[PDB]
Design a protein around this ligand. Sequence first.
Ligand SMILES: NC(=[NH2+])c1ccc2[nH]c(-c3cc([C@@H](CC(=O)[O-])C(=O)[O-])cc(Br)c3[O-])nc2c1
Ligand SMILES: [Ca+2]
Length: 223
Amino acid sequence: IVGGYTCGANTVPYQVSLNSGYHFCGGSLINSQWVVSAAHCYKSGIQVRLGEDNINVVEGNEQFISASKSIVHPSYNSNTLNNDIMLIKLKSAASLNSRVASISLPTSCASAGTQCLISGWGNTKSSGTSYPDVLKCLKAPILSDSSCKSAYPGQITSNMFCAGYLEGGKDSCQGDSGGPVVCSGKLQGIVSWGSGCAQKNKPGVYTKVCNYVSWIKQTIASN
Ligand SMILES: NC(=[NH2+])c1ccc2[nH]c(-c3cc([C@@H](CC(=O)[O-])C(=O)[O-])cc(Br)c3[O-])nc2c1
Ligand SMILES: [Ca+2]
């Protein structure tokens, strides 16, 4: 997260860190046994770390659980990143509490101008790599479809939306992929891509979760 602030330990209880010997992507806890992340974060050997704040120090409240299966969306296109969503089932359920809690799925999509909270342990520099130890947060608004398409002509599908600042300086970045975009207490987006990080006129692009609610419910139900 570039231009964000320290969230404060466990203030984002649905945030998870996907770890393969190091933090590589974020995700969101949607129930005690399932996490939603981005399909481009897929790999085997994933350990899901819940209740984290400082990813380099065990401070308490952490729960490390291996992933049992990862289900990448069948129509995921790695070239366009269309349908960049994946579900991870945990080997055992997490113990939910105030520090580890699930976030609700939306019932309607959000409108442009809705303010949302984006968080993660991704790069904090738009020029160079600087990965923080603790969780960073950023408040960003959803942009209109015309501004999004003007910014990324021919690259935005109906399963994506832009959120951010056209003036640059504040944005999600590499390492934040797979993490949550929460607006009014509902998970509306998944950090997916962008051109560089926090560059002027190049806002972040997110997977539009409201278009996948039925798929998520059907898939969880049958697995
Ligand atoms: N501006 C944003 N809102 C944004 C959000 C998520 C991103 N995830 C990434 C991202 C970048 C890489 C690098 C690879 C490297 O430097 O080693 C690449 O371009 O392939 C890789 C991943 Br995988 C990302 O998720 N860039 C991102 C940019
Ligand atoms: Ca820790």
